[PDB]
């Protein structure tokens, strides 16, 4: 692949994504650590718990790779399927996507020339809208109250058709127009001559031409089926203290599927209009608190009296997925250590502790011990490392020369706050930094926790030696 393509999610696209659907709010069993049938962590919908090990213990150990166990639907494969399996919660009623509802700008009113106050009037079950009427009084996108809906019912009858909530605006977005409204807005943009209108109608017609050119539909903007996050990404894992380690997004998804099951129990039981309109309003508020908790209303709390993380709080600022887990990420072969003074070294030379280079260069130590014949296997070399043999210091001195390593102050001030270094082996438990480059670090010896990152392959090793060594700049 060489390009990233984004679009709007179709319900048929989610149905192709699903490979299993969730209908019950159970996550796992409370006595045994196994999820039962059709749950939020289930083996039929998402996949098994361990690598090639089914639910009941009938098919395991690479014998059944692609068959499905008829007892509980488990597909016996690796744990890697638990990070890519989707949702498809069978929603009894369509709901509002709060990312396309309460954003700045909202992008559902600028598609329709409707203010956000009227959007709050229609999505919250308080006011009706009519999609089409027999007379010109009940035109398209008219905002009707419940007394005005009763007046239109006693006045028109079967001529009009005015629903309330997410289904009404869903049918309004689905059956407005596709390109005729775009052509009419394109001709009425330059038909009128103004400035306050030509700063929003051009944005509306650019949004609409993006909708027609990208192959997207306004029906796909609203949410009719909600897919859940993969359960390995929201892991209900037993921690080592006795209790469990869950995510709050699991609690929000359990509340969303609980309100969906309450809606499904309200449809067949012939519910009155107040309770089913409050049920669809609560499903809208639950999916709003699941997507972006700080937009539609009060942030939903938990047991510890804290605002729970939504799908938007998972990607927001420094605490989001981007600046904590995607852009600025923790990395292996990174040693936190203080800075000391090595004045008997060259400009491209730094110090390194023998313990930190022993534990830090462990794959290089094992490879150099296996390639020299001094160690038979990997764990024999590991026992030679753990017992501190005399020869592993010599092989560490052999592997540490002609092998640059990246010294890094946290946080860096500029580009010269991190550069490579060719380390030597000394005693102590700290890094002897060359004194000439501490001004380029702007890191005086105040116990600054410097990370030391190891370039692994020869591409990154020669990139460390020939380009970002301190002898290069």
């Amino acid at each position: 692949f060489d390009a990233i393509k984004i679009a709007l999610a179709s319900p048929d696209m989610i149905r192709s994504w699903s490979f299993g659907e969730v209908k019950k709010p159970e996550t796992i069993n409370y006595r045994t650590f196994k999820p039962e049938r059709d749950g939020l962590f289930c083996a039929r919908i998402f996949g098994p718990v361990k690598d090639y090990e089914c639910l009941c213990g009938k098919y395991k150990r690479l014998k059944h790779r692609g068959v499905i166990c008829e007892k509980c639907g488990v597909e016996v494969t690796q744990t890697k399927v638990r990070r890519e399996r989707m949702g498809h919660i069978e929603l009894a009623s369509p709901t509002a996507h709060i990312w396309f509802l309460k954003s700045l700008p909202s992008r559902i009113g600028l598609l329709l020339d409707m203010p956000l106050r009227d959007i709050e009037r229609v999505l919250y079950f308080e006011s009706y809208v009519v999609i089409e009427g027999g007379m010109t009084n009940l035109e398209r996108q008219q905002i009707l109250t419940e007394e005005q809906y009763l007046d239109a019912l006693e006045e028109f009858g079967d001529e009009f058709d005015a629903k309330m909530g997410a289904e009404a605006i869903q049918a309004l977005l689905k059956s407005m127009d596709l390109e005729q409204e775009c052509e009419q807005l394109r001709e009425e943009l330059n038909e009128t001559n103004s400035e306050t209108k030509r700063k929003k109608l051009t944005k509306r017609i650019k949004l609409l031409e993006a909708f027609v050119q990208s192959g997207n539909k306004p029906e796909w903007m609203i949410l009719t089926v909600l897919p859940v996050l993969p359960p390995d990404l929201r892991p209900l894992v037993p921690l080592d203290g006795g209790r469990f380690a869950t995510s709050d997004l699991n609690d929000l998804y359990r509340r969303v599927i609980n309100r969906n099951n309450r809606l499904k129990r309200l449809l067949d039981l012939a519910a009155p209009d107040i309770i089913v309109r409050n049920e669809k309003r609560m499903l809208q508020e639950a999916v709003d608190a699941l997507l972006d908790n700080g937009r539609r209303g009060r942030a939903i709390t938990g047991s510890n009296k804290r605002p729970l993380k939504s799908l938007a709080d998972m990607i927001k600022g420094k605490q989001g997925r981007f600046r904590q887990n995607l852009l600025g990420k923790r990395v292996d072969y990174s040693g936190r250590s203080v800075i000391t003074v090595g004045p008997y070294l060259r400009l491209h030379q730094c110090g390194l502790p023998k313990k930190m280079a022993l534990e830090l260069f462990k794959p290089f130590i094992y490879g150099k011990l296996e390639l020299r014949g001094l160690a038979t296997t990997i764990k024999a070399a590991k026992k030679m490392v753990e017992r501190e043999e005399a020869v592993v210091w010599d092989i560490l001195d052999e592997v540490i020369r002609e092998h640059p390593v990246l010294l890094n102050r946290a946080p860096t001030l500029h580009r010269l706050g991190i550069q490579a270094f060719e380390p030597v082996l000394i005693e102590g438990k700290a890094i002897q930094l060359h004194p000439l480059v501490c001004a380029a670090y702007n890191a005086d010896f105040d116990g600054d926790q410097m990370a030391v990152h190891v370039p692994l392959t020869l591409e990154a090793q020669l990139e460390a030696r020939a380009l970002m060594m301190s002898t290069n700049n």
């Binding site: 690479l62 790779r65 209790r243 380690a245 709050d248 605490q319 094992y366 024999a380 590991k382």
Partner: protein
Amino acid sequence: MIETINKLNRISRQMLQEMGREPTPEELAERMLMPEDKIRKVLKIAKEPISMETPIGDDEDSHLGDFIEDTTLELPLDSATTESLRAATHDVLAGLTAREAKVLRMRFGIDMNTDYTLEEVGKQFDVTRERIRQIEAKALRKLRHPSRSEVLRSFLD
């Protein structure tokens, strides 16, 4: 079990009000007319698991999730030996210049999909089970001697 743990919480609150000290499971077990292991079992499953965004540190910079151990662990052992032992068997069993390596690679599942017993490897070659058992014992007597399988002997750790 929700009803029994609510009754247990009410009995524990009553014994807190009647004693002042922390409620031991013995008094709750004798007042619940239940065995004590069931009381500790329903006490184990006490409450909702700590969510992932609780400030376990001193500030709001590092929440939970940066402290969980991996269940699907990939140790230096579990990453290195799981391929180096496979390469060692592919090097040693290639020296077996007859069908004993061909019936031993499917005896346990090496470089194969489905693990077979002696009967399934028999129908391909040697339908009598004890012939495959005797050639497996001959390969065991060849391999158990510490003369050339010492690199296979060092993998016991």
